[model samples]
Target: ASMTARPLSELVERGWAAALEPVADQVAHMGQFLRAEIAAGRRYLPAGSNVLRAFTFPFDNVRVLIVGQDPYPTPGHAVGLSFSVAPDVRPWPRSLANIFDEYTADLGYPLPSNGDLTPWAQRGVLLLNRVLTVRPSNPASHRGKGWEAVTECAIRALAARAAPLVAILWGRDASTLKPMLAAGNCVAIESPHPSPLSASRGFFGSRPFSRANELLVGMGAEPIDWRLP
Candidate 1:
């Protein structure tokens, strides 16, 4: 479900990827969305093989995909790719829930409840984990093959969105996106991961809400009072 957001049928209508012929930037790569789904497809659902994803954000309206490491601290909860419903409703871990909750609570408009959050697939916000397949006990073993291909695809796809879409690199895992960042139309800005432990340019220092709004404004969109409540 996460492999291809709308295929050409859906993207063309939303004007997300209609006239998006093969662009120079994305010609050589697999966009992060497809990459995340493909990477996780290997062992998770051997059935799909190519696009098996534990979670999906099956929409074309997605403006950005916040890239991160593996899925949630537990199962049924993906990192960037989200599902309609999970065994557990809490996707963010105790360690990072505060900030995660604050940011998302506002994105949904009137602070959605658990049920409302399930439609992550429709929102096109695939919360993909670097490692897609989930292990029952030991998650530490999960590692990426090479997501550069996918990140490259992402840069190209945004060319058609004709909107300001950006990539938010959270931790070291996402810094790899640096190489794939587009020069114009879409920009990639990274910061120290949002960890209280890391003193580096971590997420804690990045005013995510303000930054996101500012980014949108730069794209000719109006900035709303969407800060977390």
Candidate 2:
């Protein structure tokens, strides 16, 4: 039972239709369920068609995978990219600010003035959130939503690649998926979350971005620019 007549154009557009087709029915079923949730007064981020923004980078185009738990739960901040915010969104999340702090500490780059990470996504970084949507002002409100099924499907699809990719698992939530990434032969790096609540434990010195590039170069791929400008 399909939810809507509209095709999964995002999959097709991102050249992941084949990898994701096996779970097509699951996705559509969830779509229908999500719509029902919305009508029942549930608010979700990455609004509308943007729900699939994580997949916009294409399956084969992915060089790195950065896992996140959920959207920021703040209006205008969750633009579908994980740990990111719209350029115009003010007072970025504390975790994101900590990320910027480490970016400067690790790479010696100036702290980015904004939180827009569309550039990173465009550079083949799959900034995926485990649960794509959440109720506004209520983090993890959609924790049990069917998003886990589809995202796991997405991760499995990524794992099908012949070459090992770089997977940066931040926080305990993202760390839980290491087995799946390892099954795909990814070069996995992990550390605590960048949330002020946890950064001091180890996240500050993890050097995820640089290590990811090092791994990519070791695998004979070009390094990512990783510049916010």
Candidate 3:
């Protein structure tokens, strides 16, 4: 139930192919690996079709980038876009819960009724994960299996764009890409991961949402309407 038999080429071509054109070959290779894993009885999260869901937002339209480590390992918890889950998943992921806490504190808005973050993606925010899939109940299981190269290509492509962009890098893994973001007109907001284990360390008062908007406005771009319907 956790796998999709569709070939990665078909999936990419059907959606976000333009955005991922630069990494087409790499994505296809990764797909081959995933298929092998599935054939061997390995189950992955977010379903096969949803693995590349983050790219549904047009790459050219992106104004903000949020980097997450990987998909949630729990079944039905990961919905492709980083830090997001199926809206009906009871009790938010701890990191997402912390993110909401910061959002309301920074924006003075109430917590969103659900955990789905698709609205942000539709509005030009790229919620990308460094590694796209993980084994069920085993976080980071697919790390080094080739998703990194694909996402790195995407990140560098975004950074190379001439338009202004804001990148929110949380935790050590995501923060490692900071240097790659330096070449373009980009603002990097670095913070500790928002996991309950680390939120108190610095993620609490970072004010990343508002800071991102302020930077966007200063860069002559439209600020994001972070509120969800």
Candidate 4:
């Protein structure tokens, strides 16, 4: 259930995957809501092997959770990982750039040349978006779709774990789910959204990456490798 519980390749595995099997059904139900949009020529990013990339890491391996509002409303961006983009996508999103800036300031790591956060995920950080899918032309176009239900299920599933996970809930929308995380077995580090509109408000010096690692180390887990080359 822990192994097969994630995106393309790992979805077929069985470890925590078995335990979190209901998420698949819930995601499929979302497909129903998306059918009409797709038929009408709406496009979505992070399709194919990328959907559910948030689950790519085994459940037991999850040490941190970073929540974002939604996928990037642009072609070739939002490869299922929150605040991440494909290696080739240039002109990184402002919010992502702010995140990297904080990464550099917080951990003294140099600014990354790219926006891919996969390295962090592989090391047990679950970068998830509150709403996974969105119209390529408009952010939050799929807001009312059933994706919320599925993601909430995923959140609750993780919250049920015996060990607490460090949750970096950025932005007001993501922080609203704080009630679900509960104080039990979880450490939440929240700040204003990293968008240019709010970064200066609280995200710039938040030191989320380093703080998450600190919390993980406190939980007896390895600190994530946030060095994005």
Candidate 4 lDDT over 52-88, as tens digits, reads 6677668777888899888888777778889888787
Tens-digit lDDT string for candidate 1 (1-229) = 2333335333233333333333223312233434564587633322222222422233255555566544443544443342223334655444255445445643545443442232433444434334443433444344553333444344455444556665666667666666655656666667665545442345554565557667868887655443222
lDDT tens digits, residue span 1-229, model 2: 2234455653444467666777778778767777887799877776756667776677788889999888887788777779888788778889899999889988889989799988988888999887877878998887776777777777777887786688888888777777777663678898998878789999998999999999889888888889886
Candidate with better lDDT, 1 vs 4:
4
Worst 10 residues of 2 by lDDT: 1-10
The lDDT for every candidate, in the order shown, is 0.45, 0.79, 0.83, 0.77
Pairs with steric clashes in candidate 2: none
**TM-score, structure 4 vs. true:** 0.88
Ranking by TM-score: 2, 3, 4, 1
Q: TM-score for all predictions? A: 0.58, 0.92, 0.91, 0.88
Instruction: Evaluate model 2: give its lDDT.
Output: 0.79
lDDT (C-alpha) at residue 210 in model 2: 94
Give candidate 4's root-mean-square deviation (CA, Å): 3.6
* Clashes, model 1: 19
The reply for model 2, stretches above 4 Å from the true place, is 1-4, 10-14
Candidate 1 wrongly placed segments (more than 4 Å): 1-60, 79-92, 101-126, 146-148, 159-161, 195-201, 222-229
lDDT of 3 at 137: 91
lDDT of 3 by residue, 6-35 (tens): 443456433356546677777777777888
